[PDB]
Amino acid sequence: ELEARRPFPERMGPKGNLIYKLITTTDHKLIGIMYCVVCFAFFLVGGLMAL
Amino acid sequence: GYGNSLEWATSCPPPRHNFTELPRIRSERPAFELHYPHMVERMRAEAHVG
Amino acid sequence: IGAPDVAFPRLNALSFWLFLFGALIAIAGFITPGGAADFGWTAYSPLTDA
Amino acid sequence: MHIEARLFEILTAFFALAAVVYAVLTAMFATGGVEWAGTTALVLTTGLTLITGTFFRFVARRLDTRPEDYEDAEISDGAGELGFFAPHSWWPILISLSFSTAAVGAALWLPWLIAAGVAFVITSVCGLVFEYYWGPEKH
Amino acid sequence: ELDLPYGSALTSSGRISAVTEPGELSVHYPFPTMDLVVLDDALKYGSRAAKARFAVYIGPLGADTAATAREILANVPTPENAVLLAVSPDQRAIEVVYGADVKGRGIESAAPLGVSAAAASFKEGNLIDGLISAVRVMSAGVSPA
Amino acid sequence: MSSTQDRSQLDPEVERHTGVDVEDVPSAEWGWSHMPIGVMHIGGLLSAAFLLVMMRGNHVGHVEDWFLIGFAAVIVALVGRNWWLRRRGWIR
Amino acid sequence: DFAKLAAAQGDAIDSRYHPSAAVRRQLNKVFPTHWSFLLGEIALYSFIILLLTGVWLTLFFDPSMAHVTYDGVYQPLRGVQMSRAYETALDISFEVRGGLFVRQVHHWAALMFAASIMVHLARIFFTGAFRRPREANWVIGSLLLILAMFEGFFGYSLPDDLLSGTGIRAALSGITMGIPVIGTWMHWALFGGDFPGEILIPRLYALHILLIPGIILALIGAHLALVWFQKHTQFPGPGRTETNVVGVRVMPVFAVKSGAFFAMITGVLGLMGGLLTINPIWNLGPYKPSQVSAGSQPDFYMMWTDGLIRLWPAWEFYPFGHTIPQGVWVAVGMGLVFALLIAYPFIEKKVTGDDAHHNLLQRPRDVPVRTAIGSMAIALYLLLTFACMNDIIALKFHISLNATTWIGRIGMVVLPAIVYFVAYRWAISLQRSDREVLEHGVETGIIKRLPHGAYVELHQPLGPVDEHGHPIPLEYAGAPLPKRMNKLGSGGAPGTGSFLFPDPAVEHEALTEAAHASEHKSLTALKEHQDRIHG
Amino acid sequence: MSTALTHGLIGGVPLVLFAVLALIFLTRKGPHPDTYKMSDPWTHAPILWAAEEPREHGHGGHGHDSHGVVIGGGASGKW
Amino acid sequence: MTSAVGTSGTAITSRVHSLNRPNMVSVGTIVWLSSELMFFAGLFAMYFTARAQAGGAWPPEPTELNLALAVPVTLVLIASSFTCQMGVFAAERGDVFGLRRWYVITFLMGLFFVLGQGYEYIHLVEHGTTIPGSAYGSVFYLATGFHGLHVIGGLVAFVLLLARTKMSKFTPAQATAAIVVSYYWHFVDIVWIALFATIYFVR
Ligand SMILES: CC(C)=CCC/C(C)=C/CC/C(C)=C/CC/C(C)=C/CC/C(C)=C/CC/C(C)=C/CC/C(C)=C/CC/C(C)=C/CC/C(C)=C/CC1=C(C)C(=O)c2ccccc2C1=O
Ligand SMILES: CC(C)=CCC/C(C)=C\CC/C(C)=C/CC/C(C)=C/CC/C(C)=C/CC/C(C)=C/CC/C(C)=C/CC/C(C)=C/CC/C(C)=C\CC1=C(C)C(=O)c2ccccc2C1=O
Ligand SMILES: CCCCCCCCCCCCCCCC(=O)O[C@H](COC(=O)CCCCCCC[C@@H](C)CCCCCCCCC)COP(=O)(O)O[C@H]1[C@H](O)[C@H](O)[C@H](O)[C@@H](O)[C@@H]1O
Numbered sequence A: 001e002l003e004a005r006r007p008f009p010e011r012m013g014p015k016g017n018l019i020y021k022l023i024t025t026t027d028h029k030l031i032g033i034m035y036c037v038v039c040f041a042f043f044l045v046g047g048l049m050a051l
Numbered sequence B: 001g002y003g004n005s006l007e008w009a010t011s012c013p014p015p016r017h018n019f020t021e022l023p024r025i026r027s028e029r030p031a032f033e034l035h036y037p038h039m040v041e042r043m044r045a046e047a048h049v050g
Numbered sequence C: 001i002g003a004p005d006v007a008f009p010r011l012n013a014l015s016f017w018l019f020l021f022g023a024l025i026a027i028a029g030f031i032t033p034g035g036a037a038d039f040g041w042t043a044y045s046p047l048t049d050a
Numbered sequence D: 001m002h003i004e005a006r007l008f009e010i011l012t013a014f015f016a017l018a019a020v021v022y023a024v025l026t027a028m029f030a031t032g033g034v035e036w037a038g039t040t041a042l043v044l045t046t047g048l049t050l051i052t053g054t055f056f057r058f059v060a061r062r063l064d065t066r067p068e069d070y071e072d073a074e075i076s077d078g079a080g081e082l083g084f085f086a087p088h089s090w091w092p093i094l095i096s097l098s099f100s101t102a103a104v105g106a107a108l109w110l111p112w113l114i115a116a117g118v119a120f121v122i123t124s125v126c127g128l129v130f131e132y133y134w135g136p137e138k139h
Numbered sequence E: 001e002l003d004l005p006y007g008s009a010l011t012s013s014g015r016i017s018a019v020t021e022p023g024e025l026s027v028h029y030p031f032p033t034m035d036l037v038v039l040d041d042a043l044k045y046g047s048r049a050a051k052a053r054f055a056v057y058i059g060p061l062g063a064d065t066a067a068t069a070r071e072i073l074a075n076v077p078t079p080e081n082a083v084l085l086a087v088s089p090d091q092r093a094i095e096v097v098y099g100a101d102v103k104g105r106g107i108e109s110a111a112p113l114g115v116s117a118a119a120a121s122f123k124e125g126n127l128i129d130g131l132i133s134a135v136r137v138m139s140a141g142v143s144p145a
Numbered sequence F: 001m002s003s004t005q006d007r008s009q010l011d012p013e014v015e016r017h018t019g020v021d022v023e024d025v026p027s028a029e030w031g032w033s034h035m036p037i038g039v040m041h042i043g044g045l046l047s048a049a050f051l052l053v054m055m056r057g058n059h060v061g062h063v064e065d066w067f068l069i070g071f072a073a074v075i076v077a078l079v080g081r082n083w084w085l086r087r088r089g090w091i092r
Numbered sequence G: 001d002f003a004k005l006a007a008a009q010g011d012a013i014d015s016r017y018h019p020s021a022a023v024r025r026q027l028n029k030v031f032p033t034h035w036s037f038l039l040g041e042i043a044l045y046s047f048i049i050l051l052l053t054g055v056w057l058t059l060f061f062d063p064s065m066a067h068v069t070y071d072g073v074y075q076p077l078r079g080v081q082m083s084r085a086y087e088t089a090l091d092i093s094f095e096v097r098g099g100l101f102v103r104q105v106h107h108w109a110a111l112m113f114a115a116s117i118m119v120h121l122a123r124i125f126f127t128g129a130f131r132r133p134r135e136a137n138w139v140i141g142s143l144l145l146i147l148a149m150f151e152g153f154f155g156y157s158l159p160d161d162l163l164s165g166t167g168i169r170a171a172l173s174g175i176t177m178g179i180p181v182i183g184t185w186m187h188w189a190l191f192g193g194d195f196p197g198e199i200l201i202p203r204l205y206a207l208h209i210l211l212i213p214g215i216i217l218a219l220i221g222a223h224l225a226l227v228w229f230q231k232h233t234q235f236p237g238p239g240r241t242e243t244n245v246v247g248v249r250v251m252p253v254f255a256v257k258s259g260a261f262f263a264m265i266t267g268v269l270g271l272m273g274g275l276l277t278i279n280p281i282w283n284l285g286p287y288k289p290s291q292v293s294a295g296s297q298p299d300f301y302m303m304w305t306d307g308l309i310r311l312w313p314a315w316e317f318y319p320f321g322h323t324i325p326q327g328v329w330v331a332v333g334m335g336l337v338f339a340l341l342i343a344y345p346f347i348e349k350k351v352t353g354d355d356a357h358h359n360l361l362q363r364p365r366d367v368p369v370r371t372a373i374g375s376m377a378i379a380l381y382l383l384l385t386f387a388c389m390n391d392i393i394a395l396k397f398h399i400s401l402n403a404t405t406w407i408g409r410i411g412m413v414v415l416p417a418i419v420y421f422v423a424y425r426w427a428i429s430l431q432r433s434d435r436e437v438l439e440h441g442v443e444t445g446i447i448k449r450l451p452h453g454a455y456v457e458l459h460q461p462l463g464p465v466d467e468h469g470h471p472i473p474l475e476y477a478g479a480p481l482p483k484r485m486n487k488l489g490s491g492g493a494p495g496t497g498s499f500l501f502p503d504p505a506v507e508h509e510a511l512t513e514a515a516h517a518s519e520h521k522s523l524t525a526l527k528e529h530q531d532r533i534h535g
Numbered sequence H: 001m002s003t004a005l006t007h008g009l010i011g012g013v014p015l016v017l018f019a020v021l022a023l024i025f026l027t028r029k030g031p032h033p034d035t036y037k038m039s040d041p042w043t044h045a046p047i048l049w050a051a052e053e054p055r056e057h058g059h060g061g062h063g064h065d066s067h068g069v070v071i072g073g074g075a076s077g078k079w
Numbered sequence I: 001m002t003s004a005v006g007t008s009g010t011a012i013t014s015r016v017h018s019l020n021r022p023n024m025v026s027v028g029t030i031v032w033l034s035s036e037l038m039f040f041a042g043l044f045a046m047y048f049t050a051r052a053q054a055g056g057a058w059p060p061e062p063t064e065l066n067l068a069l070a071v072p073v074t075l076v077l078i079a080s081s082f083t084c085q086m087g088v089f090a091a092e093r094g095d096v097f098g099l100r101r102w103y104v105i106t107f108l109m110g111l112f113f114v115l116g117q118g119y120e121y122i123h124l125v126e127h128g129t130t131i132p133g134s135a136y137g138s139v140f141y142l143a144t145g146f147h148g149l150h151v152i153g154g155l156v157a158f159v160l161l162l163a164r165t166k167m168s169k170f171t172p173a174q175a176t177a178a179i180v181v182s183y184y185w186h187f188v189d190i191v192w193i194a195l196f197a198t199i200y201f202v203r
């Protein structure tokens, strides 16, 4: 009558599971996350210019 | 809570292919109807009052 | 919208990489000795010609 | 696809009106007659939306009311075989890299690099298109 | 049958689509995130050597503590090779249970050691630290099948 | 369906019982999969030291030295972060 | 009567000698049919082309520094003092029919020889074709690569030229003469005196037509004999074990395809010799110490040494009344590079501990640390190679020359680390992809489940399927997995008529049924052999 | 105007504002429940935690069946 | 692997059942072609601005259009569009080889159009007019040569689709691919009709 869950969710994940996804990513969700991270990196790069 | 737009009808990390289910889509708030069935009548009653 | 994926999911992957690499080669103007583009974002005609 | 077609029909109506009024008010009441840039751009964005809306209307008349278009459509109604959505593929990044090579070759006027980039673009587009059609190796 | 007090609905399939009010959380565990992470690290890879599913049950295990421990172990996904450490502070009780596949791998010898570590830490006043210490000791004791 | 499963018995010979595990590197038994972390830490530290040492040279320039400083600093920061996290058990 | 003549000649051969058993062994020898195993054959064929063109070139080349005024046919260099080597190279280019083509295809064959040696080295290193057995084969192959590098170095330096003579002055003279204890002595022994000594080109000609090519031929013979009698290793597969070679026999298939590959490789080399201009020595005036160009690069195989020279940060030491120039740094760097390359298999075995007799290759993904190290080394080599080209890179791609130099300097410690980390994680993620394919089947198009709106990719299991939908996961066997139903029996039977018109339905059905039967027969034969071996 | 003053202002006002806002916000009780004290009664619902450590046949639920609890020992303690 | 978990005879199939639903590939192609229309709109704007700013004699004295070579090429492009539509009909049927024949002759006629455009380019360059030579020359070359690049892209698409049909069995997926390639070719010939009417007749 009770569920066996983890004390905390997996923090990061096993070595070598994302690098190949990014190259071969075809899930819109992962691509959207790649957009957000990469786009935000350009925000910092472009924002540094304003400073 | 009280979310809508059908993206909240799935696990917070969405399953690959976004869904294991789909609720009855009736209005612009499928997830609100899914989570609060009692409001379904209310959302229609007060809709036009504005 | 309740869909599992975008219409052309290899295409949207190409769109991201075109964005990333297209963006980088624009930033690449800085590493050149002259620098990036002098003309403003608008890049008006006479100031932009060779 | 009635609403999908009607959206583009409305856009076509508005853009045609804008193109016509711009052309008239620029042929007369402008310093040098018709602008010939805004006029052409407005005419051909009217053409853009007109092509899209005409195709959507053709499809709407060709197809019976889909569950998606049908209000009061149950999930089971649309439940069935969705088509082939491409799984993981590393050809998009190669296409982007090839087009970036061609683009830098165009920027830095290097005809050799432009040719190499175009060859790589052809190769990578061929790879992407043939990805799910390259039959098993026949030895 | 009744779903959560508010906002949780049974869906077309078995899964229950639940909601939480915007300001509040879902896990509601009464432990620091870092200590929960440390315990998860233990259970996850400090037990990989044991190759036996290590489980922790902080809930109250009343009546016959041994038997309630037996059935909460049964509730573990793979009780065949599993080691469940149950702590009830409402009863100040520890109970460790093991699967049949977890036999003769040093588990039985490690049982008193793990329970002693847990008890020492608890009397010091650290439930989570005691759980981690017990998990570490038991994992060190247990040998892979 | 037109594919046959593969049976492989490669000769094995460290026994992999210490170091990396299949859960972390699925093909741990199939080849060299573990580089000691000390090796990578010392390599990063020596790379940073080499970058800093290249500042001493016959160049009147200064942006070169600043680039060396920045790259050495980020290398040392990464090495320190990794070492600290592993010391504490991959925390924070 | 060709059949009668062949039978009579066979009887004569088997009477004079008795080669029946040995010849049958050679013909029946089985060679794996993997494409990556033709990479060494590329180098072998390029070497053969090099020999054939080099004989022709030696028939016309005159090695000497004896000064001469051209008085030839090439007008832009007339009355200019030049060495006999340069004069006869110009004569080959202009006043000998097909001489320009022969020398161009020779140089292109040299470039392909180096490139294919490099690619073959990559293949063997990444697939682990050197451990326990074949480690000596790797060692002699490393010696062969070094010899090829220096052979090309002496080759493109053979026609005394402005570019190549400048390269000689840099490397052979400066590096040799900077070496602390014996540097000047080695320089004088090699050059018969000061740098422009009147024996350098004759000595290099000897070294390049007879001495070094003789050693290369001997080492290639040893290499091929070792590969022949230490049966070629193979990738893990259905019927492939550590105690068998699955492939095709020498006579019917392997021999014909190897000969055809040789034909195609020499065709590529000839096409490049025709269409692509290589080393226009006529453009590159005769060597004069006072003259120089801006390019000043060696061939791509020595480009990494030149890039090391460029990038290394001008560190010189001055002991008591002595100098230790920066040339010694690059010399020691090259020594370390070659020592590590030659001694890697022994280094790898000392580190890991594996001395087991390995006959089954391992996919580069299956060995993350070694593929990571190889990627790191290739990244460093590419960094050095482009550092040597920083001059033209800066010129064409508008980047300041100092910026390119310092990009190389910083990268040669940053880029190797980045590539190591990326390659390690990439290999592990390829392993993870293989495991996910094993445990879930191949991916396909999405389907919406009937009762509810669940979306499922509708995978296809690669093994026995459990009573319910999910399959029994398979165990990784060191062999590639099909990640596209494309490559399985799915949508692969187009009308077998022609490109423009169909064929009769009876013929098409016969052909496709026969092909399907052949595929079934091959797969069943592999399956039964695998079962017999492992049971 | 007062080059040093302007530099100090642009470098400090952001820092002062950041410090003030951090004192205001980062020093507020978070939504994470406070650590459970041993003295206090255990009010939270039962918490069973599992490692997810080993491989479990196939991910598919069906076919697992219920072989049995198959107990393999015991232990006890009272702090 | 009993038979297959995905009961499909093609590893790749139509992205949605097109009988009851819109063809996603066709929809995307139509939208992208509508965008390429705006690209050519920018080119047309350039040309029309140059025309407006010309001082009466829009084609300068050195330049002289060759209708003798411009009418055959546009007629050949119209014929190519007709043959492409015939190939589309073949693809709608299961006629793999009929589609291949129609698309091969379409590719040949498109290549003939490209070669004719190149010949007219060579003749024009010889007779003075050049991209740097004059504003008319430059706008004309930009417009018509970007269209020629689009035609070359269509030729590449044709050969690539034909290779795909060779390598895999004909299915609704390949039929739709042929349909969208034909949509691109029809768009190319339509923009060519516009460019011809503008450059040559309207001037
Ligand atoms: C030692 C060292 C590496 C110093 C750093 C200098 C350097 C190489 C910088 C990069 C060069 C580039 C890519 C310049 C373009 C501007 C730039 C930096 C843009 C941003 C780069 C970036 C991350 C872009 C994102 C997408 C991406 C990966 C784009 C890459 C684009 C390119 C140029 C790809 C090809 C790489 C390439 C060929 C670089 C030049 C290297 C060489 C040695 C070319 C040799 C070569 C030359 C030089 C000829 O002139 C020539 C003339 C006629 C026929 C043949 C050739 C020929 O083969
Ligand atoms: C203006 C001017 C002078 C122009 C000319 C340029 C010039 C100077 C020279 C080039 C001119 C020439 C002569 C070019 C052609 C070179 C040549 C001999 C090409 C042969 C290819 C050809 C014509 C094939 C025809 C198609 C056909 C029927 C092929 C099957 C029958 C044939 C020819 C089989 C040949 C088999 C073959 C390549 C034997 C090579 C012998 C050698 C050296 C090694 C054999 C060998 C091989 C090949 C391995 O791969 C191997 C792998 C692992 C372990 C051991 C071995 C091993 O021992
Ligand atoms: C199996 C072998 C296959 C090989 C096929 C061979 C291809 C043949 C190419 C075309 C014929 C060559 C004619 C020889 C006459 C000739 O040399 O060709 C020049 C052109 O040259 C250029 O620009 C480049 C033009 C672009 C097209 C050719 C590019 C081919 C490359 C891509 C093939 C090699 C592979 C390289 C891959 C690299 C990519 C890496 C990713 C043309 O004159 P021009 O243009 O005026 O030369 C200027 C001087 O005058 C002036 O001083 C000087 O300043 C310059 O401006 C010079 O250009």
Ligand SMILES: CCCCCCCC/C=C\CCCCCCCC(=O)OC[C@H](COP(=O)(O)OCCN)OC(=O)CCCCCCCCCCCCCCC
Binding pocket: F014, F015, F018, F019, F035, F036, F039, G340, G344, G347, G350, G351, G352, G353, G373, G376, G377, G380, G416
């Ligand atoms: C472009 C890149 C540069 C070119 C790269 C090519 C050069 C070769 C590459 C890498 C060499 C370094 C490898 C890493 C060495 C590992 C060190 C260690 O800590 O030892 C652990 C091992 C595992 O033992 P285990 O029972 O599995 O226990 C698991 C414990 N966690 O022990 C041992 O057997 C071995 C101990 C001694 C090893 C000595 C190896 C080097 C010999 C001198 C050759 C020069 C090296 C040049 C380095 C660049």
Ligand code: HEM
Binding pocket: G047, G050, G051, G053, G054, G055, G057, G058, G061, G089, G092, G103, G104, G106, G107, G110, G111, G113, G148, G151, G152, G154, G155, G156, G157, G158, G159, G208, G209, G213, G216, G279
């Ligand atoms: C073994 C590998 C060999 C390599 C990598 C190699 C490489 C080269 C290269 C790159 C050149 C420059 C050609 C030019 O600049 O036009 C050259 C020249 C030459 N090679 Fe070799 N070669 C090899 C073997 C041989 C052999 C076996 C011979 C004689 C049979 C030979 C004879 C010559 C001659 C005479 C020249 C001078 C041609 C000239 O000055 O244009 N080479 N070599």
